[PDB]
Amino acid sequence: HPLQVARCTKIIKGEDAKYVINLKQIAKFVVGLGERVSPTDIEEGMRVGVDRSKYNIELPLPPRIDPSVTMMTVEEKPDVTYSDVGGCKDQIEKLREVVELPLLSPERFATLGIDPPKGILLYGPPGTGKTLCARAVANRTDATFIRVIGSELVQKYVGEGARMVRELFEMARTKKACIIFFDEIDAVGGARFDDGAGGDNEVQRTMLELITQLDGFDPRGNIKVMFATNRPNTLDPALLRPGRIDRKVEFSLPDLEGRANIFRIHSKSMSVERGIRWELISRLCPNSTGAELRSVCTEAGMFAIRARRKVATEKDFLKAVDKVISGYKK
Amino acid sequence: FVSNSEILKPFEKKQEEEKKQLEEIRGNPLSIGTLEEIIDDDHAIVTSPTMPDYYVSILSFVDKELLEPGCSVLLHHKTMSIVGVLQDDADPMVSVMKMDKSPTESYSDIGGLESQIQEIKESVELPLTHPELYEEMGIKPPKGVILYGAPGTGKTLLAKAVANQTSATFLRIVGSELIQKYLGDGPRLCRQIFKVAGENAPSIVFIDEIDAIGTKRYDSNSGGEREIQRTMLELLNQLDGFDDRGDVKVIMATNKIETLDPALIRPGRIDRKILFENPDLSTKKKILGIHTSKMNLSEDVNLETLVTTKDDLSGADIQAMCTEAGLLALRERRMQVTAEDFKQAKERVMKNKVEENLEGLYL
Amino acid sequence: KDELRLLQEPGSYVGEVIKIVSDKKVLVKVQPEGKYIVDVAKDINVKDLKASQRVCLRSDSYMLHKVLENKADPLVSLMMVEKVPDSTYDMVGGLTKQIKEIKEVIELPVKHPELFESLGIAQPKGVILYGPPGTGKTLLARAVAHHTDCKFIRVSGAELVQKYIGEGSRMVRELFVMAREHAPSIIFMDEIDSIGSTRVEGSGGGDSEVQRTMLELLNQLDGFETSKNIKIIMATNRLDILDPALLRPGRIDRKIEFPPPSVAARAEILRIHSRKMNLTRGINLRKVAEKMNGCSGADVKGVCTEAGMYALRERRIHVTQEDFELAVGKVMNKNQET
Amino acid sequence: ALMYGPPGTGKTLLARACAAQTNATFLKLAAPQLVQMYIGEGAKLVRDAFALAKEKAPTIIFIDELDAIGTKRFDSEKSGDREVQRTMLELLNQLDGFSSDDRVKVLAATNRVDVLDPALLRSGRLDRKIEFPLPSEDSRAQILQIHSRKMTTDDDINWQELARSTDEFNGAQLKAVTVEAGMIALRNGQSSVKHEDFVEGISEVQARKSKSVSFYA
Amino acid sequence: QLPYLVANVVEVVGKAAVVKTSSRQTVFLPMVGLVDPDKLKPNDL
Amino acid sequence: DVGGLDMQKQEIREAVELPLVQADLYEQIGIDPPRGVLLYGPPGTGKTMLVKAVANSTKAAFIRVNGSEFVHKYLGEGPRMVRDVFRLARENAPSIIFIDEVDSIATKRFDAQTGSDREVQRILIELLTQMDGFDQSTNVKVIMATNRADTLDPALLRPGRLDRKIEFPSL
């Protein structure tokens, strides 16, 4: 039964599965007389609970129920290859040795003698290259990509962060060669202002789950972890030191070849003229972010509506690029 | 009254069996709350605003598919048992919630802004009034619109004029209300904005005068805040996750976009940047024609006479200048401004107002 | 008998009606607790309850008790709305343009709104005062509401800003909601006055934040509330810390400049104090005004106060003409020092 | 003794070494585990760790990143958050429990010392400042040798000669250098890692800075 | 009472004890015979 | 109790003893009694211990409000405390408020302090509301003392409310 609240008042039982714990911060209770473990039903179930603070032997029955299923997205063997990541092969080679290699032939490290990094850190412009690039390498590895958005872990609620991270390693032990991805680790991190200055263990015990499971016990090639940040200085140096987070992937600007492969894919979804040539207009534009490349395809149709054309001619793409050049200059 | 007595009245009067006793056995009292979790075992968890959080059971009223956690339902006071389900609009979402219907402003009352009307129309009104144009092109219309100007002209007249032609409810959210100075209120209030407009979508989201969440700086000082950094990221996920044909748009206007998060910018979601421009003399002729329809003018003064002297005024003070033009006529005891009044009224306006002088005497 | 009924009181709080339900139970929002649905009484109609309706709810049974009067009465720090405060145009007046500018800008739109509506033009709402230091417009603001039979409202930005979460918004929203029902009144704002009556000139860090939650709701009165007969009296000698866009209508509709204490203007100011004071025969009120230079309303009061100071040393209830000759040569040199 | 230095320079490496040479039980206090809100927890750790040292032989107590609870700067915030103050107040009482006994030892290590406390400076407390700079040239040859003995090699590698290319690398930065040496074997198409793979990856600067400029500017 | 309540003693005047429970309520009561001054300390039950 | 104050003592009685006792004489003149007096000079001479002795003869409540008092990083309590003092001083006529080192309060904001300092200007709002806000009447004696200041005159100078400015002779 789902338990979002538990309390008891003035109950005399018996030492063995006694409970009598008030989960509210007012009138806190504990349990003495030895140690007992009852993960299924401690005494009555129901109003037996734990919630925030740890009390004695109550640990085997945590309140793990929560409608957070909309946060974690589990996708096994994604089919995404190149959409907006066209031209990122420079970063794919960075993810080829530390991701594709241990997830394909992990036995090579026995002859090499070295070890795969416990984690891979992503870096670059905010909101660009940290999404589809992680699923692109997951296809070649035939691994399980689990994306957990850190926006719901921003809460200071006690036990929220350490509970979801613990469940990721549990499901990773069942199936080998899985990828655990943490979206926006800046929203989680190793320490924040509400951890030390506050009386909450949120993020305080969450880093322990990454230290105990990943580096401490669980293997490397079978269970991998990937992070994405907007800056390394927002992470606890304890996790930043080598042995946990080693490689740092930086998103650069694609070249002309990368822009050509992205435009030809979008040209299938959007109506375009059969006589346009993307090897020219794209060359007139300098190196730009992957987010601005999708803007060129969307803005090209806007000038076509003003020009009243069923498709986008070569002059329509020229006005869309000039709008990006004048407003960005990147 | 006659129809309801011969139709709806005998329906309830003739046959009474069920639906009367459904609200009895469970309980008479009602205490509104929110469902924490729903299951098939006929038990759930409810929490009222007074926080009497308990563990209760469920009786069959509506199917479990209609019961969703996070919505206000029909409950009991003492036993806190679920007696039914209610509407979710009773759940407080944003501290400042303003829903305006039938906006007064339109494209005809904003003057010579047609240069900027076609811009705001293509990114908002055109996908709403012509969804087939963006569908045949195989592209997604821009959801966001960036505006520049001053409140009352640039950031006001342009926002309310579009909601009139689109026949959409005006929904205003103050930019400072997005950050409540409490951790977790940033992502919560942003998701509730798209929830009200995410059912029938008979409205458009409008946000004006952002001096705060638009700038996170590097830290929680110097005008920025730490909660702003993580709030603008969730708004990006809610912007990309939001998918429609353009019935709902998000229009935000600030002074400077240089301090915005490049993530929330997300080129291709916002294709529209409208900068405030200085209107020409043709703009004043459209604003005068509205008030001259009521206030009578002399035959010796036409629209070309008043537009002669115009110094750095777009649309706002043309009404304010005509206010003094009608106030001076009250001193002469007349209800119709004539040629003698126009000359003396405009001199009291154009003069003694702007102290700084932009002049070509630098030589 | 009335005691025994009132000896045991379970207590009742205040709440606002939100919405009505077809089950004959109304939703009432509770400030310390939250929205809670109660049962209507026998003498209270459930359909007549509308939004933002102040009603009384019993705390024992948690049910509707009675219905109170509908008016805005939030936490009041110097916000109390009064009626006909004590001031007159004879004391702080004395200038022809001073009273003339107040009439058209204030009295005409507020008292007779049909004047501007007949001409198809909008009535002025905000106003800015100009002039040299020492105007004294703070006491004149009460004379405006006294002679026009309007209520006076004093707004202080210091008491409307608190550090607690939600106080930087709702406290300003209290002024936004209060002006809706109390609209037939006059509002006077503090902390922005640069003209020398009460000199603040804003706050660097204080107005660097709340200005977005305050000045934004100022224009919402005409655009959203669409409420008339609301006169916003503001003053300053320069626009710096505040919004540079305040010059737009709905915020600043007019600019009034107080004429400097010229020869003809200052001469009639001395005649004001001479009525309440005690003067002897042979005193030339025009000659004394020519002996000083640019004395504002604050300087004239001191020359009159110092003139009465020498009368106390003379053991006289009247101020002799010789005391005015020593008062001019004193206060003029007294204000120059430091 | 007061210890400070950059991370990876051996400030936390010699903590377990000092207790191993004298046969003492190792105790470490994490800095994120120190500062809290409620009065308790880390304030008891000073007395809780003393309960071991009083019974379990001498035992040496260590404090990791003392700057959290050890630096008050010019701020009185010890009164604002009493978790930091009481931990320091109980620390002064526990260090004075046995002044004649060598079985009570409390040390600490952190990045640097920004704050001097006259109460902590005396005989029987943390006084002498021991700085831990970055490892030297010959010191890195022994650390890289440890990583080479664990991995499978042909024992043809010279750890003293290849360490000449390394400059200003700590104990943690040398671990990433050995990982790069194995990545060269994959680029060269080798199952194992030969001597030519170490020469190319160790001489190249890794985990510090990447200099791609072969030309002017 | 077998369901004992958690409390933290602020001060063990001489025969009187000052304890503050987890309920944010401080009470003033004299010391009894079932407790000792060394047995009343913070971080203790 | 200290000699050489004849220059100051003669100026104190008219601005303190008369409005708190003989103020009915001001009604015969036709002017309102002075609501305060300013002090200029180094503290310790006819400033600190002298104002405490003046409250003895007037039998009025002596309240110490200084320029460095009510100074804290919290926001909103600064203007709230000043209003509560005038609220009590309005109901009780025999009250005297002495202000030492007024230049601390008189100092305005020449630069943006960013966070944690908003109260430099806020303390002038309620201090000048009890003086320039209402009409001229004395329910309390507000005495300000200046140690060293070049020019600080938000409301301070001119005889709008305050009447006498006492400058301690340096010769």
F-proximal residues of C, 295-324, CB under 8 Å: 296-299, 301-306, 308-309, 311-312, 317-319
CB atoms within 10 A of CB B327: 23
- DSSP-derived secondary structure for C281-336: TT--HHHHHHHS-S--HHHHHHHHHHHHHHHHHTT-SSB-HHHHHHHHHHHHHHHH
Experimental resolution (Å):
7.0
Measuring CA to CA, which residue among A66, A75, A73, A62 is closest to residue A21? A62
- Neighbour-count burial of C298, counting CB atoms closer than 10 A to its CB (0-12 exposed, 13-18 middle, 19+ buried): buried
Check the CA dihedral A16-A20-A23-A28 and report its sign: negative
Q: What is the dihedral of CA B75, B81, B83, B85, to 10 degrees?
A: 50
The answer to whether C250 is annotated as binding is no
Distance (Å) from the C-alpha of residue B142 to the closest C-alpha of chain C? 27
Please state, in angstroms and rounded to a whole number, the distance separating the CA atoms of residues B343 and B337.
11
Per CB-CB distance under 8 Å, the chain F contacts of C335 are: 157-159
Residues in chain E closer than 8 A to A25 (CB atoms):
22
C333 touching F (Cβ < 8 Å):
no
Q: F116: nearest CA in chain C?
A: C205
Determine, for residues B139 and A193 on separate chains, whether the beta-carbon distance falls below 8 Å.
no
Please indicate whether, in this complex, the C-beta atoms of C198 and F75 are within 8 angstroms of each other: no
User: Among candidates B46, B25, B26, which has minimal Cα distance to B35?
Assistant: B46
User: What are the tokens at A310?
Assistant: 């069923």
- Nearest residue on chain E to D43, alpha-carbon basis: E43
Q: List the F141-146 sheet strands across, edge first.
A: F61-64, F95-99, F141-146, F36-40, F164-167
Cβ pair D175, D147 in contact under 8 A: yes
Bridge partners, B82 (sequence order): B58, B75
Q: CB within 8 A of F70, min separation 6: which ones?
A: F77, F78, F81, F82, F123
Query: In what order do the strands lie in the sheet containing C12-21?
Result: C36-39, C25-30, C12-21, C53-58, C63-67
What's the gap in Å between the CA of E39 and the closest CA on chain A?
17
Residue A326 sits at the vertex; the CA angle it makes with A324 and A327, to the nearest 5 degrees, is: 65
CB neighbour list of residue C276: distance below 8 Å, 6 or more residues apart: F30, F31
- 3-state class (DSSP) for residue A147: strand
| Chain A contact set for D68 (CB, 8 A) | 196
Q: Are strands B72-75 and B82-85 parallel, antiparallel or unpaired?
A: antiparallel
Residues in chain B within 8 Å Cβ distance of F115: 220-222
Q: Which long-range contacts (CB under 8 A, 24 or more apart) does F3-11 make?
A: F5/F46, F5/F50, F7/F169, F8/F46, F8/F50, F8/F166, F8/F168, F11/F37, F11/F164, F11/F166
Helix (H) or strand (E) holding F123: helix F119-128
- Report the C-alpha dihedral over residues B125, B129, B132, B133, rounded to 10 degrees: -40
Instruction: Please give the structure tokens belonging to residue C133.
Output: 């230091």
What's phi and psi for B359, nearest 5 deg?
-145, 155
**Who contacts D34 (Cβ-Cβ below 8 Å, separation ≥6)?**
A196, D42, D68, D69, D83, D84, D87
Do residue D192 and residue A204 have CB atoms under 8 angstroms apart?
A: no
DSSP F129-171: IIIIIS-S--SSEEEEEESS-S---SS-SSSSS--EEEE----
Are the CB atoms for A244 and A214 separated by under 8 Å?
yes
A interface mutation test: which of D11, D87, D145, D183 has the most A CBs within 10 A?
D183
**A298/B126 touch (CB, cutoff 8 Å), yes or no:** no
Contact in structure between A163 and A62 (CB atoms under 8 Å): yes
Chain C CB contacts of F113 under 8 Å are: 204-205
- Is residue F160 marked as binding? no
CB atoms within 10 A of CB C287: 11
CA distance D186 to chain A (A): 8
CA pair distance C163, F117, nearest whole angstrom: 12
* Angle at CA of residue D136, ends D132 and D137, nearest 5°: 165
Give the burial class of B26: count Cβ atoms within 10 A of its Cβ; 0-12 exposed, 13-18 middle, 19 or more buried: middle
Closest CA to B171 of B132, B140, B202, B217: B202
Q: Does A312 touch chain B (CB under 8 A)?
A: yes
Which approach determined this entry? cryo-EM
D4 three-class SS: strand
Chain D residue with the nearest C-alpha to that of A112: D192
Question: What secondary structure does DSSP assign to D92-143, as a single string?
Answer: HHHHTS-SS-TT-EE-EEES------TTT-STTSS-SEEE-----HHHHHHH
Please enumerate, by residue number, every residue of A annotated as part of a binding site: 124-131
Does an interface of 3+ CB pairs under 8 Å exist between C and E? no
Q: Give the one of A11, A25, A26 whose C-beta lies nearest to E3's C-beta.
A: A11
Could you tell me if residue A103 is left (phi over 0), alpha (psi between -120 and 50 degrees) or otherwise beta?
A: alpha
- DSSP code string of C63-114: EEEEE---------SS---EES-S--TTTS---HHHHHHHIIIIIHHHH-TH
Which residues pair with residue B56 across a beta bridge?
A: B44
Q: What is the DSSP string of B235-261?
A: HHHHHHH---SSSS-EEEEES-STTS-
Q: Does any CB of chain E come closer than 8 Å to the CB of residue D43? A: yes
C132 is in an annotated binding site: yes
Q: Which residue positions of A form the known binding site for ATP?
A: 124-131
- Amino acid letter, A143: A
D87 annotated as ligand-binding: no
Q: What is the DSSP letter of A100?
A: I
Position of tokens 């002075």? Answer: F34
The residue whose two tokens read 């939250």 is C34
E strands in B218-359: 250-254, 272-274
Closest residue in D to A111 (Cα) is D192
Beta strands C63-67; C53-58: pairing state: antiparallel
DSSP B132-171: HHHHHTT-PPP-EEEE-S-TTTTTTHHHHHHHHHTT-EEE
E33–chain D nearest CA distance, Å: 26
Residue C338 annotated in ligand binding: no
Q: Do chains F and C touch, with touching meaning 3 or more CB–CB pairs less than 8 Å apart?
A: yes
> Are the beta carbons of A114 and D36 separated by less than 8 Å?
no
Cβ-contact A242, D173 below 8 angstroms: yes
Chain B residues closer than 8 Å to A294 by CB:
267-268
Residue A67 touches chain B, beta carbons under 8 Å = yes
Pick from E16, E7, E12: which is nearest to E44 by CA? E7
Whether the CB of B181 is below 8 Å from some CB of chain F: the reply is: no
Residues 6 or more apart whose Cβ sits within 8 Å of residue C313: none
Is D65 within 8 Å of D31 (Cβ atoms)? yes
Place of tokens 């046959």: B15
Among the partner residues B43, B139, B187, nearest to A270 by beta-carbon distance: B139
DSSP 3-state of C130: strand
- Residue B177 DSSP label: G
Q: Is D41 on the interface with E (CB under 8 A)?
A: yes
Cβ–Cβ gap B137/A295 under 8 Å: no
* Tokens of residue C6, six digits: 């009132």
- Helix pair C297-313, C263-276: axis angle to 10 deg: 40
Is B155 annotated to bind ligand?
yes
Q: Between chains, do A5 and B263 touch, taking CB under 8 Å as contact?
A: no
Tokens of A72: 């974690």
Alpha-carbon distance of B248 to B226, in angstroms, equals 29
Residue A111 and residue D185: Cα distance in Å, rounded?
Answer: 10
Cα–Cα distances (Å) from A281 to A259, A272, A296, A306, C108, in that order, read 10, 14, 11, 20, 65
Identify all chain B residues contacting A47, using CB atoms and an 8 Å cutoff: 55
Spell out which residues of chain A touch residue B138, defining contact as CB-CB under 8 Å: 269-271, 301
CB contact under 8 A, A125 and B55: no
Distance CA A214, CA A223 (A): 7
Q: Which chains touch C (3 or more CB pairs under 8 A)?
A: B, F
Q: Residues for chain F: how many in total?
A: 171
**CA A19 from chain center: how many Å?**
37
Q: Which of F58, F62, F61 is nearest to F13 (CA)?
A: F58
Q: Which of D37, D68, D182 sits opposite A113 (nearest CB)?
A: D182
